[PDB]
Chains A and B, each alone.
Chain A
Amino acid sequence: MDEKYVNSIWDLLKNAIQEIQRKNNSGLSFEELYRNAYTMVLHKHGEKLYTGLREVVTEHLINKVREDVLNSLNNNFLQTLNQAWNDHQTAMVMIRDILMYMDRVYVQQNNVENVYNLGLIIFRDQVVRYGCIRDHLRQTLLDMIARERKGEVVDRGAIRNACQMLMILGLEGRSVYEEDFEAPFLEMSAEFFQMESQKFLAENSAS
């Protein structure tokens, strides 16, 4: 139909998506969004919807979770990051479900990644691989694992949650998670264990 009708449909869909992302998915109708997505892709306008999706998702991430992580980099930095990841995942589940139907036609003809993969990629680019968050996360994980290696016990379930989050963030395998985690931790383990062996050769014997 006319461009005004599709623009109004997209505007309403964008408002509904933002409302869902604001932890207000209770009072919102699913059938209307599916029908709106039905008539949007029907008119061969999936490119605009996909482009609008990416802009909305990245704007929400930069506004909400980018500020939240930087505001609490010292007060439960890992706990807040995991909570934001869980909020992103649980919001994407409904976001993906509506747009997986859009994906079924879109990715099989346009040959692009799915919306769930798109959300993981943009989350990786804007949160984990940030110019400041990446180094801060790397430094804090090395510090706590070194303190754990020193002899005192710290939280261990959160570390398992963090590596699992990064493993899912890889989205293809162990490409991003391995390089990001191992390379600083391999070097940290290398120096720590080298000093440990050097200390042991003079303070003890081979018995």
Chain B
Amino acid sequence: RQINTEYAVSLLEQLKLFYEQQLFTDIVLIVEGTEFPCHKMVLATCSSYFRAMFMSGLSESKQTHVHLRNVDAATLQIIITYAYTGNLAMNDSTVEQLYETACFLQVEDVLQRCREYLIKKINAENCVRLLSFADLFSCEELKQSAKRMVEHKFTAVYHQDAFMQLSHDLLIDILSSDNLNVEKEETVREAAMLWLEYNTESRSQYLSSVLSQIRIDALSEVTQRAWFQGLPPNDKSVVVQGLYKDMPKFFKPRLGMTKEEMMIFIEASSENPCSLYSSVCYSPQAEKVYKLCSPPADLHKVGTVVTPDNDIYIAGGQVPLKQTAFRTVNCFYWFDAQQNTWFPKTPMLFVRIKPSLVCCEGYIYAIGGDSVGGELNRRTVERYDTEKDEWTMVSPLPCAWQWSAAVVVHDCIYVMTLNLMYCYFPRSDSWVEMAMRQTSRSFASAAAFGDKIFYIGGLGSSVTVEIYDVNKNEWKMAANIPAKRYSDPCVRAVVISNSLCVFMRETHLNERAKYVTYQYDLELDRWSLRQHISERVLWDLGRDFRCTVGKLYPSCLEESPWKP
């Protein structure tokens, strides 16, 4: 266990009193002309450098004035007070110098805290800076976790200025890695070319190594004469060298070109009765069913969103409290497309049940979702910031709605309910009244294809389809999906292969559920049979399962072993 806490607090606050009131100070730190009167005890408890500074036997053992150099006054003051009061106020700016002084003074505890701060602060705009920082100081855990987030993010942006100022060893590890996420192998080629041409002949010796990590499908085509233009004059040790050099190193395709348009399913019927629900996916091209990681702490009643950058997020949901037992939590998670795991993120402010997650302008919008408040503003609409990793409230929606769906069209949020629709204008944070539907239908989903909204189904569900045009602002009927009579189809609207397809599972009387998808002809207003899902690969999923459009890697994921 521990020891007496009531005296632990008394001594702690009294040492703080003896620090603010400078009485029992035998050693003072001289940093850039700033006096830091303190004790040898407190500096010893935190830092592992002062233990080699005082109890070492050097000249400073008896000297009462030490001139600590290559440090910062603010960083020293916060470190000293942290050793004195433990309140480590970590902002978003001074953490860089905080780690520098923590490593210099070898203070293990603050090193772990700032590493825990940086493991949460890793994002898009500082991935390169943190990796270089993680390369400068040995922080392998941060270095590896950065590298993974770095690997995906460089491929996406590949335009940050700190990428040019990187060590040769770091670049070789980044480029030769098999975790890059690229639609083509040519974007990494030009990224290396611009990095090599960024500086003078100091990149010439590294050019013999950077090309040794890139595949040979581009080491004989264009971007070889371009280097000859940029070659130092009369250098005959490079042009001939690269002429006969690209024989070895085993051309092999990378892993980033292995993303296929797949239908991600959540809360599917668990195969083993020991678990409540599971998550699976259907492959429209591979015609197989790949398993997915379980929702975080079997998070049920959640919502899914896929950003244009192909990122999966989970918000809302409830966990069974420790027979009916369920408690709602506002936890937020992010799915790793390669590690097959859900990385936790900043939680929301209010708990939600079945929230509608919609992405727009890089912000994740969660509209409604049976909030816990229940006050006059029983909607609690709030967006998420993907660069600052925080949540910001938005303009409340006019009318309280339940069991609603939302889509994004023309950089605007379009949320749909039983019969009403309101469009949110993110630039002014306002809501405008939209067209009114003539049919009262709920418990349905909508897919945003182009500049039109397709509300498919509604109430089991039915085959009613009401097409809404943003430019026309009107709801019109197109047709009804031809399905077997005396059945209860489960419609799922989704956009795939630049076309509006439907994932409709139908069940007949005294018969098992049948899976089949149809391709809706936009100009002909007819659902055509695109593909029939055989039951030998896909089993029953349930009723409360959700579907979304996204891309996943079949290599990182594993096939689900289950009998037809």
Contact = CB atoms under 8 A, between A and B. Distances in A.
Contact of A109 (B67, B70, B138): B138
Contacts of B138: 105, 108-109
A38 interface: yes
A42 B67 CA distance: 23
B70 A35 contact: yes
Contacts of B60: 30
A109 B141 CA distance: 12
Given A35-B70, A101-B49, A30 B57 contact: no
A30 B70 contact: no
Interface in A75-108: 90, 93-94, 97-98, 100-101, 104-105, 108
Interface in B38-91: 49, 52-53, 56-60, 67-70
B136 A94 contact: no
Of B52, B106, B140, most A-chain CB atoms within 10 Å: B52
Contacts of A38: 104
A21 interface: no
A31 B60 CA distance: 10
A102 B237 CA distance: 39
A117 interface: no
B167 to A, nearest CB: 9
Interface in A24-67: 25-28, 30-31, 34-35, 38, 42, 44
User: Mostly helix, strand, loop or mixed at chain A's interface?
Assistant: helix
Nearest to A98: B52
A147 to B, nearest CB: 38
Interface residues of A, number: 22
Contacts of B169: 44
B49 A30 contact: no
A100 B52 contact: yes
A97 B56 contact: yes
Of B53, B69, B138, B140, most A-chain CB atoms within 10 Å: B138
B506 to A, nearest CB: 59
Nearest to B61: A30
Contacts of B69: 31, 35
Given A42-B136, A105-B138, A109-B140, A26 B59 contact: yes
A49 B59 CA distance: 25
Contacts of A94: 56-58
Nearest to A20: B58
B58 A25 contact: yes
Given A101-B49, A105-B138, A109-B138, A30 B56 contact: yes
A138 B531 CA distance: 89
A50 B104 CA distance: 20
B106 A30 contact: no
Nearest to A104: B106
Contacts of A98: 52
Contacts of A44: 169
Given A100-B52, A101-B49, A101-B106, A30 B58 contact: yes
A109 to B, nearest CB: 7
Nearest to A94: B56
A130 to B, nearest CB: 29
Nearest to B68: A31
B52 A97 contact: yes
A31 B70 CA distance: 10
Contacts of A42: 136
B383 to A, nearest CB: 42
A114 to B, nearest CB: 14
Contacts of A34: 49
Interface of B: 49, 52-53, 56-60, 67-70, 104, 106, 136, 138, 140, 169
28 contacts: A25-B57, A26-B59, A27-B59, A28-B58, A30-B53, A30-B58, A30-B59, A30-B60, A31-B67, A31-B68, A31-B69, A35-B70, A38-B104, A42-B136, A44-B169, A93-B56, A94-B56, A94-B57, A94-B58, A97-B52, A97-B56, A98-B52, A101-B49, A101-B52, A101-B106, A105-B138, A108-B138, A109-B140
Which 4 A-B pairs rank lowest in CB-CB distance, beginning with the nearest?
A97-B52, A105-B138, A30-B58, A97-B56
Given A28-B59, A90-B57, A109-B138, 17 more contacts: A25-B58, A26-B59, A30-B56, A30-B58, A30-B59, A31-B68, A31-B69, A35-B70, A38-B104, A42-B136, A93-B57, A94-B57, A94-B58, A97-B52, A100-B52, A101-B49, A101-B106
